[PDB]
Ligand binder design. Sequence first.
Ligand SMILES: O=C(O)c1cn(C2CC2)c2cc(N3C=CN([C@@H]4O[C@H](C(=O)O)[C@@H](O)[C@H](O)[C@H]4O)CC3)c(F)cc2c1=O
Ligand SMILES: O=C(O)c1cn(C2CC2)c2cc(N3C=CN([C@@H]4O[C@H](C(=O)O)[C@@H](O)[C@H](O)[C@H]4O)CC3)c(F)cc2c1=O
Lengths: 596, 598
Amino acid sequence: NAMLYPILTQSRMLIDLSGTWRFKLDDGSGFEKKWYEKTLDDAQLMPVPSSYNDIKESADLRDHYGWVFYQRDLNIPAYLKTQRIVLRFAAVTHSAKVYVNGTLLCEHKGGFLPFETEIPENLIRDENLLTVAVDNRIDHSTLPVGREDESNVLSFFPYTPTKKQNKPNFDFFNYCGITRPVKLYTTPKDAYISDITLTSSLENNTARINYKIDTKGSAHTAIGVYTKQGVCVAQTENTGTEGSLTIENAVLWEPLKPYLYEVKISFGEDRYTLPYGIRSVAVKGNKFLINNKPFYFKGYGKHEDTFPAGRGLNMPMNAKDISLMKWQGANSFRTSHYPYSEEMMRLCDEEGIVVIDETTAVGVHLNFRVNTFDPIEQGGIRTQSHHKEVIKDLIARDKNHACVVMWSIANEADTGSKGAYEYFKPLFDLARELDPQKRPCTLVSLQMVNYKEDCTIKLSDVFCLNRYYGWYTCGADLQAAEKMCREELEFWNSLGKPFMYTEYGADTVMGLHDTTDSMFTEEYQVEYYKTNHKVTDTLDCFIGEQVWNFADFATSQGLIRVQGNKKGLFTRDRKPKLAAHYFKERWSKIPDFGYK
Amino acid sequence: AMLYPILTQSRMLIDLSGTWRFKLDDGSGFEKKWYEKTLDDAQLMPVPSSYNDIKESADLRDHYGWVFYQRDLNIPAYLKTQRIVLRFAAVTHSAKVYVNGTLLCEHKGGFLPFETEIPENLIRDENLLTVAVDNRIDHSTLPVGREDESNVLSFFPYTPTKKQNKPNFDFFNYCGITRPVKLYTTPKDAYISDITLTSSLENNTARINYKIDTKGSAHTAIGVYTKQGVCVAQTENTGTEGSLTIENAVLWEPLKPYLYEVKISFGEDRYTLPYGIRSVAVKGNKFLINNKPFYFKGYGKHEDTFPAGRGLNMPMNAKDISLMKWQGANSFRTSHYPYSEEMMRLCDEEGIVVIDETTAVGVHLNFGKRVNTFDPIEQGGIRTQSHHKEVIKDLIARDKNHACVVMWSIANEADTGSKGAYEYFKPLFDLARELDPQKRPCTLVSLQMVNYKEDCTIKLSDVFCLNRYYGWYTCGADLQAAEKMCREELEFWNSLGKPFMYTEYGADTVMGLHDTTDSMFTEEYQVEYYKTNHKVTDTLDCFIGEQVWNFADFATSQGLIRVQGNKKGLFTRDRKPKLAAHYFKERWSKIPDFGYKK
Ligand SMILES: O=C(O)c1cn(C2CC2)c2cc(N3C=CN([C@@H]4O[C@H](C(=O)O)[C@@H](O)[C@H](O)[C@H]4O)CC3)c(F)cc2c1=O
Ligand SMILES: O=C(O)c1cn(C2CC2)c2cc(N3C=CN([C@@H]4O[C@H](C(=O)O)[C@@H](O)[C@H](O)[C@H]4O)CC3)c(F)cc2c1=O
C-alpha cells in the first residue's frame, strides 16, 4: 500500500527502464501460447512511457480491444542482488500482468496509480526478459466505467460494428499502455523505510511537523528538517516511530508562494528525503480556509493529454502548463478524472499550485430499467469494492502533498438516484479515516433536474458543481441561461456551505468567429463565461471557478465531438483562444484570498 | 460635373449591370474591330465586378493589356424624345466605349465616373454596347506602375514568362467594369447638370448657399425638406446662384447623421439631393467638426471582397459600416482611390466621417543613371501631374456636397522628402483649395522616411497624416525599441503645434496564429504592437486621430512578404474579428468622438 516516490539516495539505486520497448497486439492466443516466455516475435517498437493508441497511423491499433504485450531486456549487475530489488510501475492503464523471465510477478487493476513488486533474487538470471501485458477493457466493474451494450455516450440509424470496441461511459478517449515510467530501485535488504507520514500543527503561534515513520526490520531512526538553502532547523536522533518537531521561523506554503522544507529520514543505512510544505486547510462556515485565510479557487479541470503520447507523462508540457496557469492568473486545478503522475503532483508542490485530487470514479451512472445503485445481483454497478481500493491507494500516494487541499470521490456519479447515499457513505467515511490531515471531501455533481436530491448535500464538505448553462441547455440563449443559472445557484447559496464550479464551458473551435452569439465561436465562449459570472459574482458562498477545460483533448468519435472535446481555453498545442485572454484579465483582478 | 444618377419625375434610370460577354484581347481585337460585331468565342463576366478572380485561370487573373466587354442594348424608342446618357460609374483603368461600332468616348482613370450621350441617329432597333478596358499601369498612370519588371515587395534574378503589370503599390491590380453601368435620361432642352451647396451657421440658423448649373433656358426652383417631409426653405426663379436659411437646423454629426432633402427643379427637370449641414475647420492643433474637437477613430480601408475584387458590393458595404459602429469607429480613409458613390452616400446616411483620397499612390521612383521622382519629364521623372490635376478636379466635382467628407488626401506615400516634391504638389494643393466650395482641409499621406523633417507635407498640409510602422517594418519584435523610436519622431511632429494623426499603423496578423510571448504574425503581437504605439500617441496633445492599417485583410501582388495578400486587417477578408479587433472595440468604447484632447 505505502508508495513512497522513488528517488536516488545514498542507500537507494534508481534505474529508469523507460525507452523503446517491443510491443505486440494480442490476437486472443497471447496467453495460451505463453508469449511472455520468449522474445516477442513479429513485434513493433513502442515508446515507454506513452499511451500506445496514437503513436502509429493504424486505426486497428488505436481502437484495439483487449490485451497488448510490452517487453524489454533487463540485464543488471549482479551486485544489485546484495540489495532489495524493486520494480515500480508508476501507471499501467488499465490492468497489468508483469512477468520476469517466465514468471508472473504481479497483477494490478486500476490504470492511474502505482504498483510495485520485489524481484526475488533466485529469479534473476544473467540475462532477463521483462514482459508487461496490458488490458484496455472497461465495463461495469472498472473505474473508469465502460458501457456493456453497443451504446455510445455521445446512432440515428442502427448499425452493427465491424469489430468489438470499448464503449467509454465518460467523455475522454480510452488511452492505454504503459502510461508512466517503469523504474527499478533498491533499498537495504534488512532495514528500510516503507512509508513516511507528515502533518502540520500551527496552534499557539508554534509551527510543528508531526511525523510517523513506517519501517521494516530493526534499526535506529532519525529525522532532520532543512531549509531550501540547507540549514538544519530541527533534528533528532534515535527517535521513536512517531514524534513532533518545532520549526522556528516557519515559512508557510501558500498558493502561488510555495515553500518546501526538505525532511530527511534515516533508518539503519536507509536514507530518504521528502519535500514538505507546511500549511493548514479547513472548511468553516462558507469559507475554504488555507492557512486561516478565505481562499477563492481560480483555475480548471484538466486532462493528462498531449500529442502524440496521449495520457503519457510529458514533463516539458507539465512545466509549460504550469507556466500558462501562472500567466493566466490561475491558482488551482482538479485532476479530472483520475490521479495524475507524481511528477505533476511534485511540481505543483514546488510551484504553489493548489490541487483538487480526484479518484478514477467517472461513469458511475447507468442511466445517463436498472438503476445505477440497484443491488449487484439485479444489475447495479459493480464498482464499490474497487472504489475503496482506489481511495486507499490515492490517499496513501498523495497524503503528504501540501498542494492537495481536497479529495474528490467521484465525477458525475448518479447521485440524485436511490441508493447513491448508501454507495457513497462508506467511501467518504474511508477518505476521512485515512487522510492524516483530514482534508475536506467532495464529489463532483452532475447537472440534474432534481438537484435538490443530490446526495452531495448529505456527504460533502464543499459542493462542487458541473454546470453548462448556455451550452447543454439554453444554447445560444444566454439571457435564458442567466435566469436558469441564478434560480439553481440561489438554492445552493442558501445552504450556507462553500460551493463552486468544477466545470463550466462551451465547445470552441479556434478560428471560428461571429460578432453575434453563435455556438462554437470564440466570442460565444467569452459571452458564455460573462453570463455565468454575472450570477456567481453575486453569491457569497460561491468560493471558486474552475472552467471546463484547461485545453482541448481527445475523446471517442461522435456527431457532437469536433475532433475531440473543444471546451479548452487553450488548444491541444496550448495556444490561447479569445476566452483565455478574457480569463487572464478577469483572474488578474480577483485575489487568491479575500475575494468574497 | 457628375450628379449621381437617380430615378425622378423627369429622369429614367435603367441599370445595365448583369451578365455581359467578355473576351481577352489577343493583340488583334482593335485591328479586327471586335466592337463592330457580336463578340465571338467569348466568356461571360458579371458586371459590375473586377474580372480577375471570377474564374480559375492565372492567365485571366494576370492578363496584361485590353479586354472587351459587350452586351445588347435594345431600348424603347419612346426614350428618343429624351436626352439619353450612358453613365459608367468606374472602369479600371482606361476605357473605350462603342455603340454599334462607333467610338463614343474614352476615359483615363479607373475610379471616377464618366458619361456620354448616345446620339439619337446612332440608335437602331437592336444595338451593341462594347466597352474596351485597359489594365496597364506605368509612370503616367494613377496608380503608378513600374517600368522595370521588378517587384515593389527576388533573391536570384529570373526572366518572367509573360509581361505583367508591376504595381508600385501594395494592393492587387483589380480591373474590369468595377461599378455599375447605367442608362439614364433627362429632358432635351433644359436640364440640371450640377449642384453646389455650402452652409454657414448663424446661431441656430443655417444659411445654405447654392449654385445650380444648368443647360438651356428655364426657371430654377429649390426647396429644402426635412427627413419627415416638411418644407423648411423654398425660393423660386433664383437663377444660378443664391441662398436660403433653415430655422433651428438639425446639424449632421458623426454617428448622429441628419440629411435634409434638397429638391431642385429646372424647367421640366427634377433632381433631389440629400444634404447634411455641418462645419469643418482646422484651428490650432484642433480638427473642429461643428466647432468641437474631433478625435478620429477608424481605418484605412480598401474596396476589396471575394470574388468581385474591387467591384461594388452593396451588402458588404452595409456590413462594414455595421462593423465599424460595433467597434466604435467614427471614420475611415478611402485608401487609395475614390470609393463608389454608393458607399459615400451610405456614409452620409450613417454618420461615418471620410477622408477622401485621390488615386495618387506610387508617385515615387526610388521606393542607366539614377533618376529623381520629380525630375523633368524629359529627364525621366514621373509623368503624372497633368492626370493628377484631372483626378483632383473630378473627385471634388463628384464628392463636394458630401457632409461625410471632411478632408482631401492629395496622394499616398509619394516621394515627398526629395527635391522637387514641393514644386509638384503646390499646384495640386492650390487646385484642391480653389475648387472645393467648402474649403475643407487638405493633406498628403506621408511615407515613413529617415529625413522626415524634410517632408514637404510640412509646407502644404493642414493636417499631418503619417503612415508609420514602429514595431513592424522597423523594430520588429522589439516593442521597447519601437516605443522609444516612435516617441522620438512623434514628439517632433507634436512640437509643430498643428493637428497630426496616424492614417496607417499595423502588423500583419494571420488569424489562428498565437503565442503568449511576442512573435510577429500572431494575434497577440498585433494587440501588443498597438498598445505600444498608443503608449506614445495618448501622451501627445496634437495627435488628433488614429486610423489603423487596415480594416480587413485584402489582396495584393505575390511576394515573399505577402502571406496570400496583406494581413494587417483587424478583420479577415470575410470580416471576422481578430483579437486586435476586440482590443479596439474596448479601446474606442472608452474614447469620445469629441473632447478626448481638449
Ligand atoms: O448530444 C447531446 O445532447 C449531449 C451529449 N453529452 C455527452 C458528452 C457527450 C451530454 C453530456 C452531459 N454530461 C456529460 C459530461 N459532463 C462533463 O462534461 C464535459 C463535456 O461534456 O464537455 C465532459 O468532458 C466532462 O468530463 C464531464 O464531467 C457534463 C454533463 C450532459 F449533461 C448533456 C449532454 C448532451 O446533451
Ligand atoms: O528575401 C529574399 O528574397 C530571400 C530570403 N532568404 C532567407 C533565409 C530565408 C533567402 C535565403 C537563401 N538561402 C536559401 C536556402 N537556405 C536553406 O533553406 C531553408 C529555407 O529558407 O526555408 C532554411 O530553413 C535551411 O536551413 C537552409 O539550408 C536558407 C537561405 C537564399 F538562397 C535566398 C534567399 C532570398 O532570396
